[PDB]
């Protein structure tokens, strides 16, 4: 891919974060805390899962950003509708307004319903996410493997403004404390 030149500066939106998350001062890193982070509840916060949105909203154009996933056992990445459900239980699917991939239990899968197996030869330490709003495309690239394609969602029904989406995952094992980090352009 040659998508890096639609690079956008993504920052995290504190107000949308699950109350156990810790967002860095520069709003470029997020990790799971070992407790509630002493914030008030609000209607934006994801209640059930360790999720947070980017501050940026997109309704047109081409956008590209990169995320560091080094040393993590579990995470979800992609984009979602601004109008996604925040409270209670839900699945990550295009029907629910999410275009995502994840790592879980040593397998990589795309967030279709049902989920789709990914074939990645080089486990990624950094993921590139490309959105073409007009084309209806969300694509994922393996930065560790020369930018190789991971997965493409096409004919997407965005149905409104889009936000960058992140899930740092639980840390029941003690092996998933590492942060997600937005990488420099
Ligand atoms: C049972 C249980 C409790 C937690 C800790 N916790 N985590 C989040 C992300 C949201 C609510 C919350 O209670 O994780 N599993």
């Amino acid at each position: 891919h040659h998508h890096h030149h639609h690079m956008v500066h993504i920052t995290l939106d504190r107000n949308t974060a699950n109350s156990w998350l810790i967002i860095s001062k520069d709003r470029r890193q997020v990790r799971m805390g070992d407790t509630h982070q002493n914030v008030s509840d609000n209607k934006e916060r994801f209640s059930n899962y360790p999720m947070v949105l980017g501050a940026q909203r997109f309704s047109s154009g081409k956008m590209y950003w990169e995320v560091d996933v080094t040393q993590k056992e579990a995470w979800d990445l992609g984009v979602c509708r601004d109008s996604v459900q925040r409270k209670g239980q839900f699945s990550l699917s295009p029907e629910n307004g999410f275009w995502t991939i994840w790592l879980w239990q040593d397998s990589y899968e795309a967030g279709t319903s049902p989920q789709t197996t990914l074939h990645i030869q080089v486990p990624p330490c950094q993921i590139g996410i490309f959105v073409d709003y007009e084309a209806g495309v969300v694509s994922f690239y393996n930065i560790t493997d020369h930018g190789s394609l991971i997965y493409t969602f096409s004919e997407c029904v965005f149905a409104g403004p889009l936000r960058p989406f992140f899930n740092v995952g639980f840390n029941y094992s003690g092996g998933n404390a590492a942060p997600l980090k937005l990488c420099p352009l």
Side-chain angles (χ1 to χ4, degrees), residues 1-184:
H1 76 112
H2 302 291
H3 294 321
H4 320 104
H5 76 84
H6 302 292
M7 185 61 112
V8 293
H9 186 77
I10 301 303
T11 61
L12 301 169
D13 185 346
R14 305 187 155 283
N15 287 351
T16 68
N18 177 271
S19 67
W20 284 54
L21 295 185
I22 303 174
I23 291 157
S24 64
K25 174 158 56 184
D26 71 358
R27 303 181 307 108
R28 300 276 285 180
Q29 308 194 19
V30 55
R31 68 188 178 83
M32 183 63 169
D34 281 332
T35 190
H36 191 287
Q37 290 309 129
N38 201 30
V39 292
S40 55
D41 192 42
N42 70 55
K43 60 187 209 189
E44 296 180 79
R45 294 196 190 290
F46 287 99
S47 65
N48 288 42
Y49 312 105
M51 294 167 177
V52 61
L53 304 186
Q56 291 70 37
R57 285 47 148 13
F58 303 125
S59 286
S60 70
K62 297 172 185 193
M63 287 64 63
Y64 179 78
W65 65 96
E66 290 177 2
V67 188
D68 194 300
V69 301
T70 296
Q71 58 166 139
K72 290 195 68 58
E73 300 175 341
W75 49 263
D76 317 322
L77 289 172
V79 293
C80 63
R81 298 185 185 141
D82 64 350
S83 57
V84 296
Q85 171 187 350
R86 310 302 173 83
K87 311 299 186 180
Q89 294 171 90
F90 57 86
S91 50
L92 296 177
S93 65
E95 308 101 88
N96 290 337
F98 299 87
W99 297 266
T100 63
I101 69 172
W102 65 75
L103 172 61
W104 169 252
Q105 300 194 165
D106 252 322
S107 72
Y108 298 93
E109 297 172 320
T112 54
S113 183
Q115 75 266 34
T116 301
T117 297
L118 302 175
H119 300 96
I120 313 185
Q121 187 66 32
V122 175
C125 306
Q126 295 98 26
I127 301 292
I129 301 130
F130 173 68
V131 180
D132 185 335
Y133 199 101
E134 276 73 29
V137 169
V138 183
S139 294
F140 297 85
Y141 297 93
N142 185 343
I143 303 315
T144 307
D145 182 44
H146 310 286
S148 63
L149 184 64
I150 297 169
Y151 191 80
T152 291
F153 293 89
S154 68
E155 288 163 16
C156 297
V157 185
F158 298 137
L162 290 176
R163 298 192 62 185
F165 173 80
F166 308 87
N167 186 354
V168 299
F170 293 100
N171 188 26
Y172 293 110
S173 62
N176 198 39
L180 291 178
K181 308 191 188 173
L182 283 154
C183 300

